[PDB]
Amino acid sequence: GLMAQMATTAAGVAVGSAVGHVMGSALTGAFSGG
Amino acid sequence: GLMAQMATTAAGVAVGSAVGHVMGSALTGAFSGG
Amino acid sequence: GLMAQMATTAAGVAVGSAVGHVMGSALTGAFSGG
Amino acid sequence: GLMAQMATTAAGVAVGSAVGHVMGSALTGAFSGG
Amino acid sequence: GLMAQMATTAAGVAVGSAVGHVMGSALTGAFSGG
Amino acid sequence: GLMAQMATTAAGVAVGSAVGHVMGSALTGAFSGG
Amino acid sequence: GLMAQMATTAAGVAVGSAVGHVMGSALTGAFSGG
Amino acid sequence: GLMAQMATTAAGVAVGSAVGHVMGSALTGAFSGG
Amino acid sequence: GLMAQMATTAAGVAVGSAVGHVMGSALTGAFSGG
Amino acid sequence: GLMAQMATTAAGVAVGSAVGHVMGSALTGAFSGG
Amino acid sequence: GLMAQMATTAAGVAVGSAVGHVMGSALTGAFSGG
Amino acid sequence: GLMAQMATTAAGVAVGSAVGHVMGSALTGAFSGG
Amino acid sequence: GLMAQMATTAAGVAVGSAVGHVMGSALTGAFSGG
Amino acid sequence: GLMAQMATTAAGVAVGSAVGHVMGSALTGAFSGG
Amino acid sequence: GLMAQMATTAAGVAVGSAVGHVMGSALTGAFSGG
Amino acid sequence: GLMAQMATTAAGVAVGSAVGHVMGSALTGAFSGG
Amino acid sequence: GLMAQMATTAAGVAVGSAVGHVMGSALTGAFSGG
Amino acid sequence: GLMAQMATTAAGVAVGSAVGHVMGSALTGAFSGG
């Protein structure tokens, strides 16, 4: 099979932009205030 | 089969924009205030 | 079969915009105030 | 006087998030399909 | 005087979230299909 | 006077995040499909 | 007066993140598809 | 099968932009305030 | 007066991150597809 | 099979830009405030 | 007056990171596809 | 199979840009504030 | 007056990192595909 | 199989640019504030 | 007045890093594909 | 199999640029503030 | 007045690193593909 | 098999540039502030 992700961005003026892609992966994260 | 995600963004002026894609993945997260 | 997600955004002026896609994934999250 | 904007975000798992702030500015944008 | 805007967001799992703030500004936008 | 913008972000797992700040500025943008 | 912008980001795992600050500036942009 | 990720970005003026790709990987992260 | 911009970033694992600051400047950009 | 990641960036003026690619790898990170 | 920009970055593992500062400058750029 | 990563960057003016590629590797990192 | 820019970077493992500073300068650039 | 990484960069004016490639390697790093 | 730029970098392992400083200068560049 | 890394850089004016390649190697590093 | 630029770099292992400083100078460059 | 690394650099004016290649080697480094 075909598994694809696409993301096209166009702008006259851009201040903040971000693109993130995740495919077939294991992500684990922990956060502690103190 | 075909599994696809698409996201097109166009703007004259953009201040805050973000695109996120997740496919076939395991994500685990924990948050603690203190 | 075909499983697709699409999202097109166009604007003259954009201040806050975000796009999120989730497909065939396991997401677990925990939040603690203190 | 005091003019302030605040935005706090916390999440166990976040896929798409964006924050935009505009203060005392002139923004002009134009969009054309073709 | 005091002019403030606040926005707090907390979630165990978040897919799409966006925050936008506008204060004392001039925004002009135009859109054309073709 | 005091003019301040703040934005705090915390997450166990983050895929797409973006922060944009505009203060006392002139932004002009134009977009053309073809 | 005091004009300040702040942005703090913390995450266990981050894939896409971006921070943009604009203060007292003139930005002009033009986009053409063809 | 074919597994592909694409991300095209075009802008007249860009201040903050970031692109992140993850495929078939194991990511583990830990955060401690103090 | 005091004009300051701050941006602090901390993460266990970071794939894509970018920080941009603009203060008291003139930016002009043009884009042409062909 | 074919596993490919692509990222094209074009801009008249760019201040902050970053591209990150991860494929078939093990990443482990730890952060301590003090 | 005092005009300062600060940017601190800390991470256990970093793949793509970039920091850009612009102050009191004139930037002009042009892009042509062909 | 074929495993490839590509990243093309073009800009009239670039201040901060960085490209990072990781393939089939083991990365371990530790951070301590004090 | 005082005009200063600071950028501190610390990481256990870093693959791609870049820092750019511009102050009181004139930058002009042109790009042509062919 | 074929495992390749490519990165092409072109700019009229470039202040900060860096390219990093990692393939089939073991990287270990430790950081201590004091 | 005082005009200073600082950039400190520390890492356990660094593959690609670059630092660029521009102050009170005129930079002109031209690029041609063919 | 074929394992190749390529990196081409072209610019009218370049202030800071660096290219790093790692293939099939063991890298270990330690950092101590004091 | 005082105009100073500083750049300190420390790393356990460094593969690619470069530092560039420009102050009060005129730089002109031209590039031609053929 | 074939294991090759290539890096081509061309610029009208270059101030800081460095190229580093590592293949099939063991690198160990230690750093101490005092």
From Swiss-Prot, chains A, B, C, D, E, F, G, H, I, J, K, L, M, N, O, P, Q, R:
It comes from Homo sapiens. This is Coiled-coil-helix-coiled-coil-helix domain-containing protein 10, mitochondrial. The lineage of its organism: Eukaryota, Metazoa, Chordata, Craniata, Vertebrata. Ubiquitously expressed. Higher expression is observed in heart and liver. It is found in: Mitochondrion intermembrane space. The chain holds residues 43 to 76 of 142 of the full protein. The gene is CHCHD10. It is linked to Frontotemporal dementia and/or amyotrophic lateral sclerosis 2: A neurodegenerative disorder characterized by frontotemporal dementia and/or amyotrophic lateral sclerosis in affected individuals. There is high intrafamilial variation. Frontotemporal dementia is characterized by frontal and temporal lobe atrophy associated with neuronal loss, gliosis, and dementia. Patients exhibit progressive changes in social, behavioral, and/or language function. May be involved in the maintenance of mitochondrial organization and mitochondrial cristae structure.
